Amino acid sequence: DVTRIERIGAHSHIRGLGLDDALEPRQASQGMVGQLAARRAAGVVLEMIREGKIAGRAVLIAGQPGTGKTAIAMGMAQALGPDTPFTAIAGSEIFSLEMSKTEALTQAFRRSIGVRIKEETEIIEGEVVEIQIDRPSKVGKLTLKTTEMETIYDLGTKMIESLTKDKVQAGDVITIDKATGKISKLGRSFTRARDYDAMGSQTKFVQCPDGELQKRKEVVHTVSLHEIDVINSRTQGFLALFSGDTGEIKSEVREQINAKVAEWREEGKAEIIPGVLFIDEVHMLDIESFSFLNRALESDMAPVLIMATNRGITRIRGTSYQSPHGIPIDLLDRLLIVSTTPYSEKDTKQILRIRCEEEDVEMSEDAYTVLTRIGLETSLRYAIQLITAASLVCRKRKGTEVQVDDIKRVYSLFLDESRSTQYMKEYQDAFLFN
């Protein structure tokens, strides 16, 4: 019914990276078709990621436009799943106006390593029923409720002070951590939502807690190595986690954190989870930034890098020099290259079928045939874009299944590049600038 904040897009139907237990790729599964050789390679590097034994590995995905390079990376990210970091950026995002291209890459690396820690807790969480105090040091008692139980505490002096500072009253829902002592309001009980009729600028209604009043347990927290660096940058640095406002972390801090994390894994207090960094459109990193990757991929703790690129032999940014993929040779031999292949008619049918299943559309077999030709005379991505429009024409026509005529109407309204650029030549002197 109600439209959530996430909805149907490009790399949406891929729900993994379709492989048997022997890492043989199936012809069609987990929303992917064809690309068998690259999908085996993707499987092997995925196994390498999951082991996490060896650092600083890198892979490059290469091949012509509309052949599944970002599809394979967006598939692999889901096969890997959450619980393991995976950070994706476009190449063009490192050109910050407040830190160097080195720092933008450094943070993108440190953001793809996770630390896991155990923590031992007890907390109290309930609706407050009555606070009572008397003057003989002060003495008092306080009563807590939860749907399962009602109970009393014989609180000491500093708690009596703290409850007055935080101005608790009956019907407030509160938490305390006993080890630390600090009080924290969560809101007021729905059962009390009427003892006033003009409420303050912010008060918030919550349900009364349930279960045991003083729950005691282990919890496990996973925290990215980057955040440990940021919290140690300045006296209230954590604010910069949200603000983005953090300015070239001093090198001796990152060194100190590495020493401490290494100590905790030897003690067994923590463990390190290696993740991935994906840079799409990597061909527009700059020559200074490439020369930094030459030593980033050599630390005792670095992610695996996956990079994707669409370029032939072409000029490296920041220089005159031609090279393969627009990448320097001193990096291309630290990499390991996976190449896609263009699709057949057979694959082009199957991938259109998966898109109509994802976008919830029915088409005639004739219509799939005609669309397949259009998606082979012109780019795959154009044929994928016709199907939504074909459906919208069909609804206006009061149909239900898309026919050949719905394809031909949309094909008349919306041009591809090749038809467009031809019409631009027939009137060229009316356009601006060449």
């Binding site: 092997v44 407040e98 080195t102 020369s291 030459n294 030593r295 005792d300 031999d333």
Partner: protein, 443 residues
């Protein structure tokens, strides 16, 4: 256990006592003249005689210049600072290029300085202000001292203190059953909290309890603390421990690096010499390893001419893989190694060389037995051959993926049929470029 990286096997230079190289030792193989040369450089750094002298490791991609630079740090060991950098680090948004270089030159020089710490700590059992038998003339009462009784897991004793302590013991909200400490070089007292013994005396209290101190009431130790000159630069250029508007404002504001003045560098040099003269502190001149030098700008190189001639500077190691390139920050000026001729006049070059087919085989075996992999000889004689047709790095790169494929197919070692399958999955730089050239109308 610790993860594995592209240099994890390099453990030293591997030389005889006579300083000649061994064919294979401490993880390295081959390059004997270059390893012998680095042998001399290690002695130069350990001599502590010299400043500013510098070396450039020059040679093609994947010939071992980074490995050799790392090996020097193993020969020196942890006690002397070795500072790594890449040429691309100079281009900061906070601070000028020449300051980045000057900071790194001051990171590669260390002090080791040693001092006693003494402290008193324990749970406070009594505060006993002690009166004299008679007051001084005209006064009602006079206190000669306070007694404080401290206890720890080892025992209990009274400390006798000056009456002026009593003011501090009510600024801090000290009460009996707290645990406190006193800094024996300063006389100041600080509360830590109520002892853990009393954690049960209410169902809730808004204080974290702290465990009873273990060991004696009075504690002493000598510690050796080690810092770079760059740490003294920064700690003087932006102070801490504020109780003033300038400090606190400066600490709520976003911190940023600043162009430290040559006066402060001057004053720090003046005072550390006083301590070195008094035998309080030991200097350890170290190494700065500027890798990928060919990324520096001509403004940077022309600053290094001054920096390397300073009587203070560390030993600098440079590296490069470029042929006759144009110098960055000029239009047309080609030069060897991508460096200006008038800097290249101030460095001793060490030359590094391509490996033979036998040497690559020997290195690939050293990778496999450190990456934790077993390989059959008929497979290694394939992988060393691939290396000879392609590159050392690519032929080493295939080891882990081959192992994974072997393990998925249920075997405990790499075999011939594994490596010739992985070779079908992953291309190299040479073969990929061929595919591009045959298809150049579609990229």
């Amino acid at each position: 256990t610790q993860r594995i990286a592209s240099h994890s096997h390099v453990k030293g230079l591997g030389l005889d006592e006579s300083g000649l190289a061994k064919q294979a030792a401490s993880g390295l193989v081959g390059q004997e003249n270059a390893r012998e040369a680095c042998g001399v450089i290690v002695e130069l750094i350990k001599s502590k005689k010299m400043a500013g002298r510098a070396v450039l490791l020059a040679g093609p991609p994947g010939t071992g210049k980074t490995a050799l630079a790392l090996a020097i740090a193993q020969e020196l060991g942890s006690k002397v600072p070795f500072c790594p950098m890449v040429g691309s680090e100079v281009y900061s948004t906070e601070i000028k290029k020449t300051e980045v270089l000057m900071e790194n030159f001051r990171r590669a020089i260390g002090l080791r300085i040693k001092e006693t710490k003494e402290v008193y700590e324990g749970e406070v059992t009594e505060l006993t202000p002690c009166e004299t038998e008679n007051p001084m003339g005209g006064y009602g009462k006079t206190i000669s001292h306070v007694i404080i009784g401290l206890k720890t897991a080892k025992g209990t004793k009274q400390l006798k203190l000056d009456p002026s302590i009593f003011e501090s013991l009510q600024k801090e909200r000290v009460e009996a059953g707290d645990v406190i400490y006193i800094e024996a070089n300063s006389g100041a007292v600080k509360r830590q909290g109520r002892c853990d013994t009393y954690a049960t005396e209410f169902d809730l209290e808004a204080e974290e309890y702290v465990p009873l101190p273990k060991g004696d009431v009075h504690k002493k130790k000598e510690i050796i603390q080690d810092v770079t000159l760059h740490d003294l630069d920064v700690a003087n250029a932006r102070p801490q421990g504020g109780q003033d508007i300038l400090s606190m404002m400066g600490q709520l504001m976003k911190p940023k690096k600043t162009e430290i003045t040559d006066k402060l560098r001057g004053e720090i040099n003046k005072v550390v010499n006083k301590y070195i003269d008094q035998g309080i502190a030991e200097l350890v001149p170290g190494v700065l390893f500027v890798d990928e030098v060919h990324m520096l700008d001509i403004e940077c190189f022309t600053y290094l001419h001054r920096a390397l001639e300073s009587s203070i500077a560390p030993i600098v190691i440079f590296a490069s893989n470029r042929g006759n390139c144009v110098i960055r920050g000029t239009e047309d000026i080609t030069s060897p190694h991508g460096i200006p001729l008038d800097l290249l006049d101030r460095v001793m070059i060490i030359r590094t060389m391509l490996y033979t087919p036998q040497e690559m085989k020997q290195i690939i075996k050293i990778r496999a037995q450190t990456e934790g992999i077993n390989i059959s000889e008929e497979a290694l004689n394939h992988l060393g051959e691939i290396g000879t047709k392609t590159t050392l790095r690519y032929s080493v790169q295939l080891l882990t993926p081959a192992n994974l494929l072997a393990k998925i197919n249920g075997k405990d070692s790499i075999e011939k049929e594994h490596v010739e399958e992985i070779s079908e999955l992953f291309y190299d730089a040479k073969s990929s470029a061929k595919i591009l050239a045959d298809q150049q109308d579609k990229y």
